[PDB]
């Protein structure tokens, strides 16, 4: 239902692969749209498309009389938490307009995959380092974030990389780097 004076957008429920399963049929009032589907397969992974190529959208599960923020969430998570800190300022080069820092990075997010029982290892946290990290997820084929220092010139000497995994799914990625960046707002007036 639009907040106010906003045209009705297109909606469509398909499969995570891409095949469509259901469509939304609007009524005479025009202030809301309706879409209904009931699964009959062993796994039902669903995606909600909202097409407009602000607005309010409601999603429910097993909610007869949904008319008139539940107990739990009903959408997955790919939200990444970030954090950066500065430890040193190695130098400043006025004439070439760049500077260097030595810092540390923290990326952490939630994934229902990559979980593990405490029986496979007898342990509670698993650790990977250096280039073995590239030798994990490809077999599992689950997407990882990949960052990039946008305004970096040259190479980035990172001396340590580590990711800790907790059975429920939480993974925290740390990094320690030394990089040279560009400063384009130097004003000598």
């Amino acid at each position: 239902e639009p907040i106010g004076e906003a045209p009705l957008p297109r909606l469509r429920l398909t499969d995570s692969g891409g095949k469509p399963l259901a469509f939304g049929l609007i009524d005479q009032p025009g202030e809301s749209v309706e879409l209904n589907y009931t699964c009959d397969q062993d796994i039902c992974e669903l995606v909600v498309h909202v097409d407009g190529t602000v607005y309010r959208l409601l999603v429910g599960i097993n909610a007869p009389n949904l008319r008139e923020v539940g107990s739990s969430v009903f959408l997955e998570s790919d939200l990444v938490t970030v954090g950066l800190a500065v430890d040193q300022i190695v130098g400043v080069d006025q004439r070439s307009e760049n500077f260097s820092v030595v810092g540390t990075l923290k990326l952490s997010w939630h994934d229902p995959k990559l979980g593990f029982s405490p029986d496979q290892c007898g342990c509670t946290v698993k650790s990977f380092e250096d280039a073995s990290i590239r030798a994990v997820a490809g077999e599992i084929n689950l997407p990882l974030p990949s960052f990039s220092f946008y305004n970096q010139q040259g190479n980035r000497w990172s001396q340590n990389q580590v990711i800790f995994v907790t059975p429920d799914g939480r993974a925290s990625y740390f990094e320690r780097f030394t990089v040279t960046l560009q400063a384009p707002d130097f004003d000598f007036l």
Partner: protein, 197 residues
């Protein structure tokens, strides 16, 4: 034409496989070719271009190529301030002392200017390759070098010539160097206006 020149820079991307296996077909700009801020205030971009050609290799193999070109120009605020201002002042005063009839002092200032210029000669050469020809800035300094070693000749001739008593030649010839010195540089500038502007 240094330092009044506008050079061009190229980026060439080439394929490592023959034409029959791959080629380049179309040029697509998914982003702005030249970003708004780049640094390097000394050079300023005025245009750009992209094109695709075909270059030969080996004996019967050719590969694609894709060229990006940038056209640039040089700012003149640094050069006008470190070189052109100190050089104009030293030449002007070495011409205004000519009003004083204290001879030999004319030699003393002109001798010192010989020492200064060889310093300005090494300074300018500091940031250029060991070139094989003549720039513009190199011609200007050659003219001032040769001209100033001629006024010392006149001053040493004037000093001896006034010992005999023939000051009439000395005073009359003194005014001659009062017009040749400021006229010549104006002549040289005109010869530079036509060849570049």
């Amino acid at each position: 034409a240094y330092p009044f020149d506008r050079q061009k820079f190229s980026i060439k991307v080439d394929l490592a496989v023959p034409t029959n296996m791959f080629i380049f077909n179309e040029i697509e700009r998914f982003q702005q070719v030249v970003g708004d801020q780049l640094g390097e205030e000394e050079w300023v971009v005025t245009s750009y271009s992209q094109e695709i050609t075909e270059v030969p290799f080996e004996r019967g193999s050719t590969n694609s190529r894709f060229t990006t070109t940038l056209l640039v120009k040089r700012n003149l605020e640094y050069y006008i301030l470190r070189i052109f201002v100190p050089l104009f002042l030293i030449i002007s005063v070495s011409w205004v002392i000519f009003f004083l009839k204290d001879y030999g002092r004319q030699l003393e200032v002109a001798s010192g200017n010989l020492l200064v210029f060889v310093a300005f000669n090494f300074t300018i050469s500091g940031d250029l390759p060991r070139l094989g020809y003549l720039t513009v800035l190199d011609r200007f300094m050659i003219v001032s070098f040769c001209l100033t070693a001629i006024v010392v000749l006149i001053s040493v001739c004037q000093k001896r010539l006034g010992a005999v008593g023939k000051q009439a030649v000395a005073a009359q010839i003194d005014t001659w160097v009062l017009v040749i010195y400021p006229l010549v540089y104006s002549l040289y500038i005109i010869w530079v206006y036509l060849r570049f502007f």
